[PDB]
Amino acid sequence: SEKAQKWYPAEDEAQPKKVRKAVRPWTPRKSLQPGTVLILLAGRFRGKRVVLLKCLDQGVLLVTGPFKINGVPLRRVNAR
RNA sequence: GCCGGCCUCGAAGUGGCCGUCGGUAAUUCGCGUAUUGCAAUUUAGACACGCGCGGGAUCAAAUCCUUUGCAGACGACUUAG
Ligand SMILES: [Mg+2]
Numbered sequence: 402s403e404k405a406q407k408w409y410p411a412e413d414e415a416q417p418k419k420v421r422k423a424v425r426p427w428t429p430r431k432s433l434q435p436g437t438v439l440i441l442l443a444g445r446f447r448g449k450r451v452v453l454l455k456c457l458d459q460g461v462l463l464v465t466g467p468f469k470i471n472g473v474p475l476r477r478v479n480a481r
Numbered sequence: 482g483c484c485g486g487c488c489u490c491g492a493a494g495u496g497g498c499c500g501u502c503g504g505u506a507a508u509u510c511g512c513g514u515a516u517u518g519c520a521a522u523u524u525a526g527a528c529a530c531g532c533g534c535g536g537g538a539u540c541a542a543a544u545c546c547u548u549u550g551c552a553g554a555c556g557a558c559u560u561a562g
């Protein structure tokens with residue numbers, strides 16, 4: 402499917418050069434361990450104390466305050 | 482906290498004990514919270530002020546004008562109507 406294009410630009414589009422910015426895993430703080438009780442500083446559940454379950458890829462955390470203990474469900478938050 | 486008796490509070494009007502009426506985890510629980518989607522002021526208060534509801538209360542003055550001369554450049558002022 403390397404056919405001729407239906408349209409051609411007025412002048413050749415400049416391509417960007419290679420960036421050399423490899424993606425490397427985020428390293429969470431030593432205090433972010435599973436089961437740690439954390440206070441939510443912002444968002445809908447600001448001021449709520451929830452339980453950390455897992456650390457996600459790019460500074461995101463999976464937490465749940467026990468929904469029957471406080472009305473926080475399973476939720477993603479930001480480690481910051 | 483809400484309203485009611487009262488009793489005392491004059492440096493620029495204060496607090497109280499006596500009652501009503503409400504709400505109230507000191508302990509332990511049972512249901513609800515989710516979807517504001519990974520943060521985005523937590524629009525939440527008391528000072529007002531201007532209003533409209535629908536009532537109570539109340540039914541006033543001032544100036545011009547004329548007049549006086551204890552006054553006066555004109556205003557103003559002292560009077561009287
Ligand atoms: Mg009671």
Ligand SMILES: [Mg+2]
Nearest residue numbers: 550551552553
């Ligand atoms: Mg004279």
